[PDB]
Amino acid sequence: DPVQREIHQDWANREYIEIITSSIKKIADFLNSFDMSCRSRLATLNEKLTALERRIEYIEARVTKGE
Amino acid sequence: GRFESEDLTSIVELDGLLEINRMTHKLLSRYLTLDGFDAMFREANHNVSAPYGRITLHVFWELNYDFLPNYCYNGSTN
């Protein structure tokens, strides 16, 4: 009786735990995919910025004198 | 560089070769971010910080040393 009772309570206790640990894993996964998604945007921003930098250096060279 | 080592008649080849380079640029630009083709060309032609490119200068060089003194005009065929 005290054992049967403890076992029923253990199932409930472990399910709750499984629910929490499961959520902690969804947070961890978001963090990863969010990290990757931001890595792509940063690279894209870096790509465009670099091109704009080069373009400005080019235009300046057309409007200025040389050494 | 090829044009600078040939006579004036080789300018037609230069133009065709440049057009192939322009096409190559277009094909590559679909996946990569490259300097504008015109910017690339002017830099190679040394026509960015200078008024006359290498092509123009070589055209004149050839006129002076080859075309004027060595060529005969045929008015009927032009």
UniProtKB/Swiss-Prot annotation, chain A:
Superkingdom classification of source: Eukaryota
Subcellular location: Cytoplasm, Cytoskeleton
GO cellular component: cytoskeleton; cytosol; extracellular exosome; lamellipodium; SCAR complex
GO-annotated molecular function: identical protein binding; protein-containing complex binding
InterPro entries, per the entry: BRICK1
GO biological process, one term: Rac protein signal transduction
Coiled-coil features, chain-numbered ranges: 36-67
Chief location bin: cytoplasm
Alphabetically ordered keywords of this record: Acetylation, Coiled coil, Cytoplasm, Cytoskeleton
Function of the protein: Involved in regulation of actin and microtubule organization. Part of a WAVE complex that activates the Arp2/3 complex. As component of the WAVE1 complex, required for BDNF-NTRK2 endocytic trafficking and signaling from early endosomes.
Sequence similarity: Belongs to the BRK1 family.
Complex formation: Homotrimer when in free form. Directly interacts with WASF2. Component of the WAVE1 complex composed of ABI2, CYFIP1 or CYFIP2, BRK1, NCKAP1 and WASF1/WAVE1. Within the complex, a heterodimer containing NCKAP1 and CYFIP1 interacts with a heterotrimer formed by WAVE1, ABI2 and BRK1.
Name of the protein in question: Protein BRICK1
Species this chain originates from: Homo sapiens (Human)
From Swiss-Prot, chain B:
Subcellular location(s) per record: Cytoplasm; Cytoplasm, Perinuclear region; Cell projection, Lamellipodium; Cell projection, Ruffle
Similarity field: Belongs to the CYFIP family.
Oligomer and partners: Component of the WAVE1 complex composed of ABI2, CYFIP1 or CYFIP2, BRK1, NCKAP1 and WASF1/WAVE1. Within the complex, a heterodimer containing NCKAP1 and CYFIP1 interacts with a heterotrimer formed by WAVE1, ABI2 and BRK1. Component of the CYFIP1-EIF4E-FMR1 complex which is composed of CYFIP, EIF4E and FMR1. Interacts with FMR1 but does not bind to related proteins FXR1 or FXR2. Interaction with EIF4E stimulates FMR1 binding. Component of the WAVE2 complex composed of ABI1, CYFIP1/SRA1, NCKAP1/NAP1 (NCKAP1l/HEM1 in hematopoietic cells) and WASF2/WAVE2.
Function, in words: Component of the CYFIP1-EIF4E-FMR1 complex which binds to the mRNA cap and mediates translational repression. In the CYFIP1-EIF4E-FMR1 complex this subunit is an adapter between EIF4E and FMR1. Promotes the translation repression activity of FMR1 in brain probably by mediating its association with EIF4E and mRNA. Regulates formation of membrane ruffles and lamellipodia. Plays a role in axon outgrowth. Binds to F-actin but not to RNA. Part of the WAVE complex that regulates actin filament reorganization via its interaction with the Arp2/3 complex.
Other comments on record: Breakpoint hotspot for the Prader-Willi/Angelman syndromes and may be implicated in autism. Commonly altered in tumors.
Listed name of the protein: Cytoplasmic FMR1-interacting protein 1
Organismal lineage: Eukaryota, Metazoa, Chordata, Craniata, Vertebrata
